[PDB]
Amino acid sequence: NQEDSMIMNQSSIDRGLFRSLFFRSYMDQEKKYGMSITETFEKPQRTNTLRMKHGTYDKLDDDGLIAPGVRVSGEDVIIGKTTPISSKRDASTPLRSTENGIVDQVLVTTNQDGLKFVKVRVRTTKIPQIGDKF
Amino acid sequence: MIVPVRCFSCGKVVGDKWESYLNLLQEDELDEGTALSRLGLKRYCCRRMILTHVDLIEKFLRYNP
Amino acid sequence: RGNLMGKRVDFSARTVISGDPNLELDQVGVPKSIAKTLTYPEVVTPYNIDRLTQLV
Amino acid sequence: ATLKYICAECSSKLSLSRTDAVRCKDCGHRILLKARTKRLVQFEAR
Amino acid sequence: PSLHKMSMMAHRVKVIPYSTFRLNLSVTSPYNADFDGDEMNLHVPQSEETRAELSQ
Amino acid sequence: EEGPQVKIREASKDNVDFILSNVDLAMANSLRRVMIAEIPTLAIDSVEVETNTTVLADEFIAHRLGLIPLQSMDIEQLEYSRDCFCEDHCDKCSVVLTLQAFGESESTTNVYSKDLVIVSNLMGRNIGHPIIQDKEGNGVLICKLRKGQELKLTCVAKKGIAKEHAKWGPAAAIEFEYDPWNKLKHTDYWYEQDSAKEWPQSKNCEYEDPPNEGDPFDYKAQADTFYMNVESVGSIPVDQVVVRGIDTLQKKVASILLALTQM
Amino acid sequence: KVFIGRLPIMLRSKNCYLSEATESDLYKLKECP
Amino acid sequence: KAIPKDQRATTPYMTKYERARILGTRALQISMNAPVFVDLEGETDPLRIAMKELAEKKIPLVIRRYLPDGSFEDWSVEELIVDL
RNA sequence: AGGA
Ligand SMILES: [Mg+2]
Ligand SMILES: [Zn+2]
Ligand SMILES: [Zn+2]
Ligand SMILES: [Zn+2]
């Protein structure tokens, strides 16, 4: 506990001392292009583009969304999306590389424009550790 | 936000004692210092657990789904 | 000034620092994760050959 | 069985697929949620 | 900031658990570090030659 | 009667006040640690969540579940899962608990440690029963639900020790004192005018003879006679918190004696 | 008579719904009192 | 231009930098499977092998010391004193 | 927009 550091009761930490919740909301939308060339929220596979993320797409459902129960981890794909070009290109949203957690709430709404609007909250419990500030 | 089971410092169960505490104050009218003591909360670590709790759960319950 | 006198560099790491009364003056506590990321290029020599094969 | 999306306010289940219209049935609001996986999630009690 | 040649010194690795760089307290002063949330940089040499510069 | 002696001052379901004499401080302290840290208990360790429509998060609940005290009387006949031979768990190494709750009432629906149910076969041993000390008989208040707030989950309670997690802590605070008159000169009292007036006397001052000023310092003197108080959480009865502590430390030293023997 | 654009309203102001709103309404409206 | 051995006037002692660079160099060479001029009495680290080589002044290297004018004095690691 |  020398030079502005401190000793914490691990026993208390277990008991719930200073534990917190952490939520982060990843968001995306289906961008429309002039000639009705809209995007697609789907779970894509190889099928020409090959230009897609490495994270397990296998956590996604047919709507290109993870169900709100699943424990997500690496750059696991949280939102599946495709962009058409004059063909499946990938516009998927992976979990922030470093971060890990559980899918909390998935919001499937509409943009003012009348477009597919998606918001994915991902929750984790952050327990007091050795470099944590107080 | 919802009564802590077990006092962080010593680990004596504190989970059962919430409603009982809240009651020793409304119905029995007693002061906080005597209520805790009735409930057998001797050490201040245990006392602070209940005495400083903020049962936010109730406010959360006020929303629908 | 930004790309030549200074440079962003590989084989570099950074985290929160905390003191240890059980470390020697000249040592530095490195987190397992940080050691598992940073790498040293060791030339396969008859001295190290067997050690290195096991690390591999 | 199956309740693909749930309503945000009236909380009525919706079970819709692509090109159905992003709205509730008897309720207005275009909000809608996702209803948790049928696959159980296990957590340690520590 | 690195206003000293002592703001950059060579240390022995000690691989340890927990996510912090651990330092002996007596080495605190030259760096001007404290543990109120300070962060430090670590650079790994790649040559037998480079290490010799650090150690020697 | 033999070696180190006990003299119980006060006993209850939850507390044991006693005096330990003809012992080294090292031994009283070692036992103090053992009671806190190494006595095995049974606690909820894995929680599969089927549905949770609550204001609380899955893991927030999961955590509270571990802290719920469970009957660990016959914990000695339950195997540590790690030592058990099954793919994961079984009746030989675990207690399966079920918790299903729903807001039928317009008023708030409460979820208690009483609402737990044993689904595993117990083999007629006293284990896994949620400890209820509560006056109205409800135990720990786990959750609160309004209406369509459903809670469905399954628990796997496993044998463990406080070293792994303080949830397997069989004891709450353990009181410990020796030499209430500072006869041993083991402390140097901080004062402003008088250490006698400024520092309150303890209960145990009565149980020991005051030093009587006109006497030289007993350097010869060593520390024996320890006024302790073991508080049980309910998992194990207070007597056993002490007995098992003595036993665990014995078995611990035994391991060393045996380890030398294998060598 | 004539529509001349849209003015962003400040929450809890006269022109905001929430001003005349009661604790109970806000909880229904999903707003923290 | 190259100052003759009988006209050298720089320290007869080895500089901190010279030693560091010699050890670094031999260590590198040893590590690159160069021939080792001393019995490795169980030794495996190329720096510790280099220190052993410098200890017995069995290192076949020469420090070319440049003067501000551009001239220089060549000194063998065998001849330089190691009081460091 | 914050941290030493
Ligand atoms: Mg600082
Ligand atoms: Zn306490
Ligand atoms: Zn609706
Ligand atoms: Zn088993």
Which residue matches tokens 């020409």?
A48
Q: Rounded to whole angstroms, how far apart are CA atoms E28 and E36? A: 13
Q: Rounded to whole angstroms, how far apart are CA atoms A108 and A125? A: 25
Q: Rounded to whole angstroms, how far apart are CA atoms E42 and E20? A: 12
Six-digit token string for H81: 């004193």
> What's phi and psi for F96, nearest 5 deg?
-100, 125
- Decide if F100 contacts F198 (C-beta within 8 A): no
List of residues 6+ apart from D28 with CB closer than 8 A = none
Which helix (H) or strand (E) segment is E31 a member of? helix E28-31
Closest CA to A80 of A50, A110, A111, A45: A45
CA dihedral F5, F29, F177, B47 (to 10 degrees): -120
Q: Rounded to whole angstroms, how far apart are CA atoms F56 and F230? A: 34
Rg (CA), chain H: 14
DSSP letter at H14 equals P
- Helix F238-262 vs helix F25-37: angle between axes, to the nearest 10 degrees? 100
- Decide if C19 contacts E35 (C-beta within 8 A): yes
Query: Cβ of G5: how many Cβ atoms within 10 Å?
Result: 4
Dihedral angle sign, alpha carbons of residues E1, E7, E9, E12:
negative
User: Contact A15/F166, CB-based, under 8 Å?
Assistant: yes
Instruction: Tell me how many degrees the CA angle F30-F32-F34 measures, rounded to the nearest 5.
Output: 70
Burial of A54 (0-12, 13-18, 19+ CB in 10 A): exposed
- Pairing status of strand F171-178 against strand F117-118: unpaired
Q: Does any strand I atom come closer than 7 Å to the Cβ of E41?
A: no
G/C Cβ contact: 3+ pairs below 8 Å: no
Query: Cβ of A113: how many Cβ atoms within 10 Å?
Result: 10
DSSP string, chain F: --SSEEEEEEE-SSEEEEEEES--HHHHHHHHHHHHHTS-EEEEEEEEEEEE-SSS-HHHHHHHHHHS-B--SSGGGSPPTTTS-SSS--TTTEEEEEEEEE--SSSPEEEEGGG-EE-S--TT-S--PBP---TTS---EEEEE-SS-EEEEEEEEEEE-TTT-GGG--EEEEEEEE-SS-TT--S----SS-HHHHS---GGGTTS----SSS---SS-----EEEEEEE-SSS-HHHHHHHHHHHHHHHHHHHHHHHHH-
Domains F1-40+167-263 and F41-166 share a fold: no
Q: Rounded to whole angstroms, how far apart are CA atoms F104 and F148? A: 8
- Decide if A86 contacts A120 (C-beta within 8 A): no
Residue E38: nearest nucleotide (C-alpha to C1'): I4
Distances (CA, A) of G22 to D10, G28, H72: 20, 10, 92
Closest CA to D5 of F103, A111, A118: A118
Q: Rounded to whole angstroms, how far apart are CA atoms D32 and D21? A: 11
Instruction: Tell me how many degrees the CA angle A41-A46-A50 measures, rounded to the nearest 5.
Output: 95
Q: Rounded to whole angstroms, how far apart are CA atoms F202 and F177? A: 9
Distances (CA, A) of F91 to F74, F94, F121, F180, H11: 14, 5, 6, 50, 82
Closest CA to H18 of H59, H65, H51, H50: H65
Q: Measure E36 CA to I4 C1' (Å).
A: 8
User: Contact A15/F67, CB-based, under 8 Å?
Assistant: yes
Which helix (H) or strand (E) segment is A22 a member of? strand A20-29
Q: Rounded to whole angstroms, how far apart are CA atoms A9 and B7? A: 13
Instruction: Specify the 3-state DSSP secondary structure of C6.
Output: coil
**Could you tell me the domains of chain D?**
1-46 (2.20.28.30)
Chain F residue numbers touching A125 (CB-CB < 8 A): 57, 59-60, 63
- Decide if F232 contacts F14 (C-beta within 8 A): yes
Pick the CATH number of H1-84 from 3.40.50.1010, 3.90.940.10, 3.30.70.360, 3.40.190.10: 3.90.940.10
Q: Rounded to whole angstroms, how far apart are CA atoms F172 and F135? A: 20
Which residue matches tokens 């006056």?
F135
Fold annotation for F41-166: RNA Polymerase Alpha Subunit; Chain A, domain 2 (2.170.120)
Residue E34: nearest nucleotide (C-alpha to C1'): I4
List of residues 6+ apart from F131 with CB closer than 8 A = B13, F68, F69, F70, F71, F113, F139, F233, F234, F235
How many Å lie between the alpha carbon of C50 and the closest alpha carbon of chain E? 19
Six-digit token string for F161: 């020790």
Displacement of CA A48 from its chain's centroid (Å) = 25
Instruction: Find the closest chain A residue to E24 by CA distance.
Output: A2
Q: Rounded to whole angstroms, how far apart are CA atoms A114 and A130? A: 48
User: Contact A4/E25, CB-based, under 8 Å?
Assistant: no
DSSP string, H16-34: HHHHHHHHHHHHHHHHTTP
Displacement of CA F7 from its chain's centroid (Å) = 22
DSSP string, A69-131: T-EE-SS-EEE--B-------B--EE--TT--EEEEEEEEEE-TTS-EEEEEEEEEEE---TT
Q: Which residues 3-32 of A have a C-beta within 8 angstroms of E?
A: 3-5
Q: Which of C5, C27, C36 to mutate to test the interface with E (most CBs of E within 10 A)?
A: C27
DSSP string, D1-46: ---S-B-SSS--B----SSS-SS-SSS----------SSPEEEE--
Six-digit token string for F231: 């508080």
Which helix (H) or strand (E) segment is A23 a member of? strand A20-29
Burial of F127 (0-12, 13-18, 19+ CB in 10 A): buried
Instruction: Find the closest chain E residue to C26 by CA distance.
Output: E11
DSSP letter at C38 equals -
Q: Rounded to whole angstroms, how far apart are CA atoms F68 and D16? A: 41
Query: Cβ of A51: how many Cβ atoms within 10 Å?
Result: 10
Q: Rounded to whole angstroms, how far apart are CA atoms A130 and F118? A: 38
Instruction: Specify the 3-state DSSP secondary structure of G21.
Output: coil
Dihedral angle sign, alpha carbons of residues F11, F17, F20, F24:
positive
How many Å lie between the alpha carbon of E37 and the closest alpha carbon of chain H? 36
For F149, what's the count of Cα atoms within 13 Å in the CB-facing half-sphere? 23
Identify the bridge partners of residue A77 per DSSP, sorted by sequence position. Answer: A94
- Decide if F111 contacts F143 (C-beta within 8 A): yes
Six-digit token string for D1: 């069985």
Residue E36: nearest nucleotide (C-alpha to C1'): I4
What separation, in Å, do the N-terminal and C-terminal C-alpha atoms of chain E show? 24
- Helix H46-55 vs helix E48-55: angle between axes, to the nearest 10 degrees? 70
Q: Rounded to whole angstroms, how far apart are CA atoms E4 and E24? A: 19
User: In this structure, which ligand is nearest to the CA of B10?
Assistant: 2
User: Contact F46/D43, CB-based, under 8 Å?
Assistant: yes
Closest CA to A107 of A23, A28, A30: A28
Q: Rounded to whole angstroms, how far apart are CA atoms C50 and H10? A: 45
Distances (CA, A) of F137 to B20, F43, F119, F141: 12, 20, 21, 11
Which residue matches tokens 């006693």?
F18
Q: Measure E37 CA to I3 C1' (Å).
A: 8
CA dihedral E45, E48, E50, E56 (to 10 degrees): 110
Q: Does any strand I atom come closer than 7 Å to the Cβ of E38?
A: yes
Among all residues of A, which ones are annotated catalytic?
Answer: 4
User: In this structure, which ligand is nearest to the CA of F92?
Assistant: 4
Task: Place domain A20-127 in its CATH homologous superfamily.
Answer: RNA polymerase II, Rpb2 subunit, wall domain (2.40.50.150)
User: Contact A106/D33, CB-based, under 8 Å?
Assistant: yes
- Helix H46-55 vs helix H16-31: angle between axes, to the nearest 10 degrees? 130
- Decide if F175 contacts F36 (C-beta within 8 A): no
Three-state secondary structure of B1-64? CCCCCCCCCCCCCCCCHHHHHHHHHHCCCCCHHHHHHHCCCCCHHHHHHHHCCCCCHHHHHCCC
Q: Rounded to whole angstroms, how far apart are CA atoms G7 and F249? A: 75
Q: Rounded to whole angstroms, how far apart are CA atoms A74 and A101? A: 10
Q: How many angstroms separate the alpha carbon of residue F175 from the centre of ligand 2?
A: 12
Dihedral angle sign, alpha carbons of residues B7, B13, B19, B25:
negative
Six-digit token string for F99: 């918790």
Which helix (H) or strand (E) segment is C13 a member of? strand C12-19
Burial of D28 (0-12, 13-18, 19+ CB in 10 A): exposed
Q: Measure C14 CA to I2 C1' (Å).
A: 18
Q: Does any strand I atom come closer than 7 Å to the Cβ of E37?
A: yes
Identify the bridge partners of residue F232 per DSSP, sorted by sequence position. Answer: F171
Chain D residue numbers touching A102 (CB-CB < 8 A): 41
Fold annotation for F1-40+167-263: Gyrase A; domain 2 (3.30.1360)
DSSP letter at A26 equals E
**Could you tell me the domains of chain B?**
1-65 (1.10.10.60)
What separation, in Å, do the N-terminal and C-terminal C-alpha atoms of chain C show? 40
User: Contact H31/E51, CB-based, under 8 Å?
Assistant: no
Beta carbon pairs, A and E, within 8 Å: 21
H/E Cβ contact: 3+ pairs below 8 Å: yes
